[PDB]
Amino acid sequence: MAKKDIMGDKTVRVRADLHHIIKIETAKNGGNVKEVMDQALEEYIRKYLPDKL
Amino acid sequence: MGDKTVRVRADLHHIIKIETAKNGGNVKEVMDQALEEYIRKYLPDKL
Amino acid sequence: MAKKDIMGDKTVRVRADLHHIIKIETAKNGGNVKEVMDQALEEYIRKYLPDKL
Amino acid sequence: KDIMGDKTVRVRADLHHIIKIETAKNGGNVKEVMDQALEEYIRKYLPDKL
DNA sequence: GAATCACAAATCACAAG
DNA sequence: TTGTGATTTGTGATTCG
DNA sequence: GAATCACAAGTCACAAGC
DNA sequence: CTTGTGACTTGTGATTCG
Numbered sequence: 001m002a003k004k005d006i007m008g009d010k011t012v013r014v015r016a017d018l019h020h021i022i023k024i025e026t027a028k029n030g031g032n033v034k035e036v037m038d039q040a041l042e043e044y045i046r047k048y049l050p051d052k053l
Numbered sequence: 054m055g056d057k058t059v060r061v062r063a064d065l066h067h068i069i070k071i072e073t074a075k076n077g078g079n080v081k082e083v084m085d086q087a088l089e090e091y092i093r094k095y096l097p098d099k100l
Numbered sequence: 101m102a103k104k105d106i107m108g109d110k111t112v113r114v115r116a117d118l119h120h121i122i123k124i125e126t127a128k129n130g131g132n133v134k135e136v137m138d139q140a141l142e143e144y145i146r147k148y149l150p151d152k153l
Numbered sequence: 154k155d156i157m158g159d160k161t162v163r164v165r166a167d168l169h170h171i172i173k174i175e176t177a178k179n180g181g182n183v184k185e186v187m188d189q190a191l192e193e194y195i196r197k198y199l200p201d202k203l
Numbered sequence: 204g205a206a207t208c209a210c211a212a213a214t215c216a217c218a219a220g
Numbered sequence: 221t222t223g224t225g226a227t228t229t230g231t232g233a234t235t236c237g
Numbered sequence: 238g239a240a241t242c243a244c245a246a247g248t249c250a251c252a253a254g255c
Numbered sequence: 256c257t258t259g260t261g262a263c264t265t266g267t268g269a270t271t272c273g
Contacts, residue, residue, distance in 0.1 A: 001064075003064040003067075004062060004064045007062070007063040007064045007067070008063045009060040009061060009062060009063055009245090009246090010060065010061060010062070010063040010066040010067075010259095010260075011058055011059070011060050011061075011247095011248090011259075011260050011261075012058070012059050012060070012061050012066060012080055012081070012084055012259080012260090013056045013057075013058060013059075013080070013081040013084065013257090013258060013259070013260095014056060014057050014058070014059055014081070014084045014085060014088060015054070015055075015056065015057075015084075015085045015088070015089075016054040016055050016056055016057045017054045018085065018088045018089060018092060019057035019059070019088075020054075020057070021092060021096070021099050022088070022092070023127045023247095024124075024127050024128055025096065025099075026127075027123045027124045027126075027127035027128075028124055032245090032246060032247090032266095033059060033246075033247075034059060034060055034061065034245090034246060034247080035246095036091070037059050037061050037084075037087075037088070038061055038062050038065065039091065040084075040087045040088045040090070040091035040092075041061055041062075041065050041069075041083075041084065041087045042065060043087070043090070043091060043094075044083065044086065044087035044090065044091075045065060045068060045069075049068065049072060052068045052071075052072070053065075053068065056257090056258085057247095057248085058247075058248060058249075058260090059246095059247080059248095060245095060246070060247070060248095079257090079258065079259090080258075080259070081257085081258060081259085103167075107165055107166055107167060108165075108166045109163040109164060109165060109166060109264090109265080110163070110164050110165075110166050110169035110170075110240095110241085111161050111162065111163050111164070111240080111241065111242080111266090111267080112161070112162060112163075112164055112169065112183060112184065112187045112239095112240080112241095113159040113160060113161050113162070113184055113187075113239075113240080113267095114159060114160055114161075114162055114184075114187055114188055114191055115157050115158075115159065115160070115188050115191070115192075116157060116158045116159060116160045117157060118188065118191045118192060118195060119160035119162060119267095120160075121195055121199060121202045121203075122191075122195075125199055125202070132247090132248095132264095132265065132266085133162050133163070133265075133266070133267095134162065134163040134164070134264085134265060134266080135265095136194065137162050137163060137164045137165075137187075137191070138164060138165045138168065139194065140190045140191050140193070140194035141164055141165075141168045141169075141172075141187065141190045142168060143190070143193075143194065143197075144186070144189070144190035144193060144194075145168060145171055145172075145190075147193075149171065149175060152171045152174075152175065153171075159239095160266095160267070160268095161241090161266075161267045161268075162265095162266075162267080163264095163265060163266075163267095182237085182238095182239060182240090183239080183240080184238095184239055184240080185239095
């Protein structure tokens with residue numbers, strides 16, 4: 001989407017313990033943290049702020 | 054433990070600013086929740 | 101250290117399974133791949149090539 | 154077989170140089186050495202994993 | 204995983220045998 | 221005609237990254 | 238095939254304002 | 256203080272070079 005396609009990334013804070021779990025996971029299996037964050041965040045929005053996306 | 058930093062898609066971060074400005078809250082709250090709800094949904098094992 | 105504070109990085113390619121071990125260990129117990137590369141290589145040069153340090 | 158793929162990593166510049174000169178001088182390449190140093194690290198500190 | 208060294212074996216070539 | 225030297229070409233081993 | 242590059246992910250440490 | 260963020264570091268697939 002235009003706004004996704006074109007805009008950049010933006011730094012955000014997160015609970016370390018939650019973060020760490022994800023980092024361990026990705027180190028083991030595939031992927032990377034941002035990837036999961038972006039999904040986690042998207043799924044939040046689609047559920048709690050459906051119209052905004 | 055405390056906080057870690059993550060870069061996320063600016064178009065989503067945008068949506069969250071607007072909302073937390075308009076109704077209550079802050080960006081960190083949403084992340085913390087979003088991640089916990091994700092981790093529960095897909096990696097519940099990790100207790 | 102002055103020399104060491106402005107010291108840059110070269111990139112090198114290592115066996116994947118070795119990398120994967122480090123990826124996992126660091127993600128669990130802190131540190132990062134580069135940190136480990138540096139220590140590993142210094143200890144090796146110190147071991148077999150002490151002149152060059 | 155022990156065919157195995159690779160992964161790019163960073164190393165401090167001066168150290169890489171010391172290898173690049175020694176291997177240039179008396180044969181070998183950096184990749185070999187850089188692997189050997191890594192394997193030996195892993196045996197020192199993470200032998201279980203090896 | 205191509206380029207360039209280095210060296211062996213075809214290709215030629217004029218002259219003598 | 222055919223043996224010697226000069227000459228070019230194919231190719232396996234080797235360098236550079 | 239080793240070596241290097243450049244663009245993405247990840248972290249840091251000052252900035253804003255609670 | 257806690258939270259927000261741009262500058263900087265680290266990570267690594269893509270690309271070069273021969």
